[PDB]
Each structure stands twice: as C-alpha cells, then as structure tokens.
C-alpha positions as a printed Julia matrix, in Angstrom:
403×3 Matrix{Float64}:
 -68.06   68.17   36.76
 -67.04   69.38   33.24
 -68.13   66.72   30.7
 -68.81   66.18   27.0
 -71.44   64.29   25.0
 -70.25   62.02   22.19
 -72.64   60.82   19.47
 -71.58   58.17   16.96
 -73.31   57.91   13.58
 -73.48   54.42   12.01
 -73.88   53.99    8.21
 -73.69   51.06    5.74
 -75.47   55.26    2.44
 -78.12   54.39    5.07
 -78.21   54.66    8.88
 -78.43   51.41   10.85
 -80.25   50.88   14.12
 -79.62   48.02   16.56
 -75.81   48.24   16.48
 -74.16   48.21   19.93
 -71.14   50.34   20.73
 -69.07   49.98   23.9
 -66.94   52.77   25.36
 -63.75   51.74   27.17
 -61.5    54.0    29.3
 -57.95   54.14   27.82
 -56.76   57.29   29.58
 -53.58   55.48   30.76
 -53.01   53.64   27.47
 -53.35   56.78   25.35
 -51.02   58.78   27.64
 -48.22   56.22   27.18
 -48.69   56.15   23.43
 -48.57   59.97   23.42
 -45.3    60.0    25.39
 -43.77   57.56   22.9
 -44.75   59.89   20.05
 -43.32   63.0    21.76
 -39.98   61.32   22.58
 -37.2    63.63   23.86
 -38.6    66.69   22.0
 -39.25   70.13   23.52
 -42.9    70.15   22.39
 -45.21   67.21   21.68
 -45.8    67.29   17.84
 -49.13   67.96   16.14
 -48.86   64.39   14.73
 -48.8    63.03   18.27
 -52.54   63.0    18.98
 -53.27   61.16   15.71
 -50.32   58.77   16.09
 -51.33   57.76   19.63
 -55.0    57.32   18.59
 -53.93   54.89   15.86
 -51.66   52.92   18.19
 -54.31   52.53   20.87
 -56.98   51.62   18.28
 -54.83   48.79   16.91
 -54.75   47.27   20.42
 -58.56   47.16   20.53
 -58.75   43.36   20.5
 -56.65   43.19   23.66
 -58.05   46.32   25.31
 -61.71   45.21   25.21
 -60.77   42.27   27.43
 -59.04   44.46   30.06
 -60.14   48.12   29.92
 -62.88   49.6    32.1
 -66.22   50.08   30.32
 -67.8    53.51   30.86
 -70.87   53.13   28.63
 -72.84   50.94   26.25
 -75.23   52.34   23.68
 -77.24   50.8    20.85
 -77.88   52.93   17.78
 -81.42   54.22   17.33
 -83.44   56.99   15.66
 -81.35   56.77   12.49
 -78.17   55.13   13.77
 -77.43   57.4    16.74
 -75.52   56.24   19.83
 -74.95   59.12   22.27
 -72.63   58.64   25.21
 -73.72   61.48   27.45
 -71.73   63.21   30.21
 -68.29   61.77   29.46
 -65.62   63.36   31.76
 -62.96   65.54   30.08
 -60.65   64.94   33.03
 -60.14   62.28   35.7
 -60.08   63.27   39.39
 -56.36   64.18   39.08
 -56.8    66.73   36.28
 -55.51   64.42   33.49
 -57.41   64.4    30.22
 -59.4    61.26   29.4
 -59.09   59.0    26.36
 -62.07   56.82   25.29
 -62.06   53.74   23.0
 -65.27   53.19   21.01
 -65.92   49.77   19.49
 -68.9    48.01   17.9
 -69.68   45.02   20.16
 -73.05   43.76   18.76
 -75.37   44.25   15.7
 -69.57   45.93    7.74
 -68.12   46.47   11.22
 -67.28   49.99   12.41
 -63.56   50.65   12.66
 -62.68   51.02   16.39
 -61.19   54.4    17.28
 -60.0    56.49   20.2
 -61.14   59.93   21.29
 -58.78   61.89   23.54
 -60.17   64.91   25.38
 -60.26   67.8    24.94
 -61.52   68.21   21.42
 -61.17   71.7    19.99
 -63.55   73.37   17.52
 -62.54   74.54   14.04
 -61.68   77.97   15.53
 -58.96   76.17   17.5
 -59.6    77.65   20.97
 -63.1    76.49   22.06
 -63.79   73.09   23.66
 -66.55   70.84   22.22
 -69.18   69.41   24.59
 -71.31   67.69   21.94
 -69.01   65.7    19.69
 -70.28   63.96   16.56
 -68.23   61.11   15.1
 -68.78   59.12   11.88
 -66.72   55.87   12.29
 -65.84   54.42    8.86
 -66.65   50.71    8.42
 -64.28   47.8     7.72
 -65.55   46.41    4.38
 -65.36   42.64    4.74
 -63.78   41.17    1.6
 -63.11   37.61    0.45
 -60.43   35.41    2.06
 -58.76   32.03    1.6
 -56.92   30.58    4.59
 -54.54   27.62    4.92
 -55.53   25.79    8.12
 -52.15   24.7     9.38
 -51.02   25.79   12.85
 -47.26   25.85   12.17
 -44.55   28.34   11.07
 -43.6    25.99    8.19
 -46.11   24.94    5.53
 -44.48   21.8     4.25
 -46.26   18.62    3.16
 -45.44   15.23    1.7
 -47.09   14.52   -1.68
 -50.54   13.03   -1.13
 -51.01   14.52    2.38
 -54.26   16.38    2.99
 -54.1    20.17    3.45
 -57.05   21.94    5.1
 -58.34   25.19    3.57
 -61.12   27.65    4.51
 -62.85   30.04    2.1
 -64.81   32.97    3.53
 -66.77   34.92    0.9
 -69.07   37.91    1.22
 -72.79   37.39    0.55
 -74.53   40.71   -0.45
 -77.57   42.26    1.27
 -79.65   42.12   -1.96
 -78.79   38.48   -2.58
 -82.44   37.47   -3.15
 -82.59   39.86   -6.15
 -79.76   37.98   -7.88
 -79.59   34.84  -10.04
 -76.5    32.82   -9.09
 -73.56   32.84   -6.64
 -70.3    31.22   -7.76
 -67.06   30.16   -6.06
 -64.27   29.12   -8.42
 -61.12   27.57   -6.92
 -58.01   27.96   -9.09
 -55.08   26.13   -7.35
 -51.57   26.88   -8.63
 -49.78   24.12  -10.58
 -48.94   21.32   -8.13
 -52.04   21.52   -5.91
 -55.06   19.29   -6.38
 -58.3    20.26   -4.66
 -60.48   17.38   -3.46
 -63.96   18.55   -4.45
 -65.7    15.65   -2.66
 -64.41   17.08    0.64
 -66.36   20.33    0.19
 -68.62   21.43    3.06
 -70.43   24.72    3.58
 -71.36   26.21    6.96
 -75.15   26.23    7.45
 -76.15   25.09    3.93
 -77.32   21.59    2.99
 -75.42   19.75    0.26
 -78.66   19.51   -1.68
 -78.78   23.3    -2.21
 -75.74   23.7    -4.49
 -73.86   22.08   -7.37
 -70.11   21.35   -7.62
 -68.16   20.87  -10.85
 -64.58   19.53  -11.05
 -62.55   21.74  -13.38
 -59.59   20.9   -15.6
 -57.02   22.91  -13.57
 -57.63   20.54  -10.61
 -59.87   23.18   -9.03
 -63.67   23.38   -8.91
 -66.69   25.65   -9.27
 -69.47   25.74   -6.73
 -72.8    27.05   -8.1
 -75.55   28.23   -5.76
 -78.94   29.6    -6.92
 -79.23   33.0    -5.22
 -82.49   32.17   -3.41
 -80.69   29.48   -1.43
 -78.5    32.22    0.06
 -81.35   34.4     1.41
 -80.65   33.74    5.14
 -77.0    34.66    4.3
 -77.72   38.25    3.22
 -75.01   40.53    4.63
 -73.06   37.54    5.98
 -69.81   35.66    5.31
 -70.23   32.2     3.76
 -67.65   29.73    5.11
 -66.53   26.86    2.87
 -64.03   24.2     4.04
 -62.19   21.99    1.5
 -59.15   19.68    1.42
 -56.37   19.55   -1.16
 -53.11   17.7    -1.76
 -49.84   18.1    -3.66
 -49.17   16.09   -6.8
 -45.88   16.9    -8.57
 -45.4    16.19  -12.3
 -42.85   19.01  -12.82
 -39.85   18.68  -10.46
 -39.07   22.42  -10.78
 -42.09   22.83   -8.45
 -40.1    21.25   -5.61
 -39.12   23.86   -3.0
 -41.44   26.49   -4.55
 -44.45   28.11   -2.88
 -47.77   26.67   -4.04
 -50.74   29.0    -3.32
 -54.42   28.11   -3.57
 -56.71   30.74   -5.12
 -60.43   31.45   -5.31
 -62.89   33.94   -6.84
 -66.46   34.57   -5.68
 -68.92   35.79   -8.32
 -72.49   37.2    -8.16
 -74.24   36.94  -11.52
 -71.6    38.64  -13.69
 -69.66   40.7   -11.09
 -66.47   39.03   -9.8
 -65.1    39.7    -6.32
 -61.38   40.35   -5.77
 -59.61   37.0    -6.22
 -58.05   35.79   -2.95
 -55.03   33.61   -2.19
 -53.85   31.33    0.66
 -50.46   30.98    2.36
 -48.11   29.06    0.02
 -47.44   25.37    0.71
 -44.11   23.69   -0.02
 -42.67   20.26   -0.6
 -39.01   19.27   -0.42
 -36.63   16.59   -1.62
 -33.08   15.2    -1.53
 -30.49   14.25   -4.17
 -27.83   11.55   -3.71
 -24.76   10.25   -5.57
 -23.33    6.75   -5.26
 -19.51    6.83   -5.2
 -16.43    4.69   -4.44
 -15.49    5.35   -0.81
 -11.78    5.33   -1.77
 -12.21    7.36   -4.98
 -15.19    9.69   -4.9
 -14.89   11.06   -8.46
 -15.96    7.51   -9.51
 -19.74    7.13   -9.65
 -21.43    3.72   -9.66
 -24.37    2.22  -11.56
 -26.66   -0.63  -10.47
 -27.29    0.42   -6.87
 -30.87    0.2    -5.55
 -32.02    2.35   -2.65
 -35.36    2.3    -0.81
 -36.83    5.35    0.95
 -37.48    4.54    4.6
 -37.92    6.12    8.02
 -35.49    5.33   10.83
 -35.92    5.76   14.6
 -33.31    4.67   17.18
 -31.17    3.24   14.34
 -33.95    0.79   13.24
 -36.0     0.99   10.04
 -39.54    1.57   11.34
 -41.41    2.35    8.1
 -41.17    2.07    4.32
 -42.31    4.65    1.8
 -44.74    3.65   -0.96
 -45.64    5.59   -4.12
 -43.94    8.75   -5.45
 -44.26   12.56   -5.76
 -47.02   12.36   -8.39
 -49.25    9.63   -6.96
 -48.28   10.56   -3.41
 -46.56    8.63   -0.65
 -47.77    6.52    2.24
 -45.6     5.01    5.01
 -46.24    1.76    6.87
 -44.51   -1.42    8.09
 -45.08   -3.31    4.79
 -41.6    -4.31    3.44
 -43.03   -4.92   -0.04
 -43.57   -2.66   -3.07
 -41.27    0.01   -1.61
 -40.33    3.31   -3.25
 -37.01    2.44   -4.77
 -34.51    4.04   -7.19
 -31.65    2.64   -9.33
 -28.42    4.52  -10.14
 -27.08    4.97  -13.66
 -23.41    5.47  -14.59
 -23.5     8.99  -13.11
 -24.47    7.47   -9.75
 -27.47    9.81   -9.28
 -30.78    9.26   -7.52
 -33.34   11.42   -5.67
 -36.52   11.3    -3.59
 -38.75   14.36   -4.02
 -42.11   15.51   -2.62
 -41.22   15.06    1.06
 -41.93   17.3     4.01
 -39.06   18.75    6.03
 -37.24   16.49    8.49
 -38.43   18.73   11.36
 -42.05   17.93   10.46
 -41.46   14.21   11.2
 -42.5    12.43   14.39
 -40.22   12.46   17.45
 -36.92   10.6    16.92
 -37.68    9.86   13.25
 -35.34   10.59   10.34
 -35.52    9.94    6.61
 -33.07    7.38    5.21
 -32.1     5.48    2.07
 -31.62    1.75    2.61
 -29.48    0.0     0.01
 -31.1    -3.23   -1.17
 -28.87   -3.82   -4.22
 -25.14   -3.11   -4.25
 -23.22   -2.22   -7.46
 -21.33   -5.22   -8.85
 -18.09   -5.77   -6.92
 -19.05   -3.39   -4.09
 -20.11   -4.29   -0.55
 -23.76   -3.88    0.34
 -24.2    -1.16    2.98
 -25.49   -2.76    6.19
 -27.0     0.42    7.7
 -29.45    2.9     6.13
 -27.93    6.29    5.25
 -29.68    9.1     7.2
 -30.51   12.3     5.35
 -32.0    15.71    6.05
 -34.75   17.56    4.14
 -35.1    21.31    4.61
 -36.33   24.3     2.68
 -34.4    24.59   -0.6
 -32.53   21.31    0.08
 -33.48   19.88   -3.36
 -33.62   22.61   -6.01
 -30.52   24.57   -4.96
 -28.37   21.49   -5.65
 -27.31   20.08   -9.03
 -27.85   16.32   -9.44
 -24.06   15.83   -9.54
 -23.59   17.59   -6.16
 -25.97   15.3    -4.28
 -25.19   13.76   -0.88
 -22.26   11.42   -1.52
 -22.78    7.82   -0.41
 -19.6     5.74   -0.13
 -19.29    2.08   -1.13
 -16.32   -0.17   -0.34
 -14.7    -2.08   -3.24
 -14.7    -5.87   -2.87
 -11.09   -7.0    -3.12
  -9.47   -9.51   -5.44
  -8.55  -13.1    -4.67
  -5.15  -14.48   -3.79
  -4.65  -18.01   -2.26
C-alpha cells in the first residue's frame, strides 16, 4: 500500500526524449550483496548500501535476462521517465531494491535503488525520488579478433582487428574525420583489407604510411548518418620480423581518431606474440664439441611422418604445404648453432602435429639422422635462451676403417 515514485532525468547539457528505461526487481539480489558487505559485524556499515548497489549494478548484463520487470518508461517532456507507485516493501515486509537500465533510445550507467530512501534530514522517507543517472561516455577502441587465451601467430599469418571510433553529433559542421593506425614495430597492417560498416569504399581515401600503418580520410559530410554513433572499421595485419629481439615480445596495434584538429585518446589492442627455437649440433659422445656443415629443414610431423614443409622466413613470412622443394633450411657454423624464429606456439598447431627439424645434410664424418628431431615452441622459448644453450642435437661419429 505504501509506495514511492521514482523519476529519472536523462541528459547528454541537454535533456533527451525517446530514451527507454526498464525497471527490474532485484530485492533478493541486493539483500545478498548487503549481507556480504555486513559480514560477521554487529551492525551493517554505512558503506554497505553503496557497496551492494555497486555490486548489483555490475551484474546488470546478466540480471536483465533473468530479473522480473516492474516497469518500462520512455523519457518525455524534457527527458523525464517516472516510475509511479513503486512498492517500498514486498508482501513479507522486506524492503525492495530496483535496477534501472536504459534499454532503447552516451548510454546511462545502470544503477540500483534500494528502499527506503531517506531525506537530507535523515529521518523522513521520500515518496518522490529524483535520480540523475550519469552516462557512460563511449570512447575509441581497438580490438584483436582472436578467440583464444594465447595471441600467438606465425610470421605472415593474418590477424583480424576491429576499430570502433566515436562520431560526434555535430559531425556535419566539421571538415574531415581521420583514423591513423600506428602498429608497433613488427606488425604490418594490410590497408587493402580495410572495410567500414555502412559506408561505401567510394566515400573515403586510404593512404599507406611509412610505419606500416595507414591513414583513412573521410570528408565530414559523408559521416552525417553516423552522428552520435560508433564507426566500425575492420582490417587485417601480419607479423614481419626484421629485428629478432622482437621475438617473444608483445606487439600491440594502435590507432588515433581525429576530427579536424582535435585528436581522440589513442587506443591500443591486445598484444600479439611470435615465438622461436634455438638448436645446437653436437657430437653425441662428446657434447662440448659443436659441428659445422649440418643442414636442417623446418617441417611439421604427425604420427612420426613429415606431413608438411615450411617455406619462407620470419621477415617474408612462412607457408606450409606438401612441396618438398625450396624448404626453409639452415646451415650450422663451427659453433653448431641454428634457429627458426617467427613461429606460433606448439599448442596452436593442428591436432597431433609437432614442429621438427629434419636433417638433410650431415656434418662430414657424421651419420645422417634418419628421423626428424621434434621440438616445442612456447612463450619465451626463444629469447630467454642464449644461442649456445639451444636444444642439443646429437650426431654419431662415423668410425674408422680396419680390414
């Protein structure tokens, strides 16, 4: 019987009509949050109401899909959405908690109101409550589109990126809108792969820049239907390594949106990585002795058979196929050292596959290995290892003659 009226005010300062808010019942959810905050203490803290509000608000995504809806109101008459006659208590005398979220229309921050609300005097209960929900200012974003816990790629492999940039309300008053991609050393952006959501290719210009990034240039008038919106740009990139100290280091992509002269906050993607492996050719009977003249190919093995051969390198990128010719191959000097770098982690490989080096030329007077030597690439497996401490590979000395 005893109820309150709750009015939300929506701003952007200027009031906005036509924005929907939905009220969900979170009585039970708030109560449990409140208990957690009060713990084993003799008196629920002052902090507790605030703390439990926050916690329930942060579960808004989930709670909209499950919690009872008690009202829907669209803002009108200068951004007003009144939810009239909201119960202070349920039918068991417990106080109600209400989640308010913008569901249709700078989105309003969701927030929770737990009854009762007291006036500034501290003793009287409010029946007409007036809230001003602050708005989540959308800002720029760059995303790596890679549904995995590990962001590891072979050199040459395509990496999908998304760029979401804010387009102002007063876009039509402006001259030019600009999106500059600045990839960190090691990443090459493929400008010819650029697409933009809801915007014909004939409405913008793309320049390839000398840091392997690019600048998109859009005349402001072409972005009129995008006023107040996010502009989504998809683009591909790849890793190309000319400095080996980049192996096993995080390689972010970056981007800045610009309107006329005013830059947005630069944004950054998840880092990508590429790995490698170092090897040392030794005498099986005497492993301090390192051997020159050995040639190893990089291959993939499954079920003990060589299934594929690597082509190319860490700069130009690798491909793998069943062509036994023009294979990525290294030759050992007197220190016995070789390496293959710019490879994704062993876990990223197909089922049953493993990297391997297949010996195709033995050092003079040493037996040619008949099987490929398996190896394992992981995070840090290349750069945390001196050349001399590479994976030892043992060769058997050919013996002398006696009649």
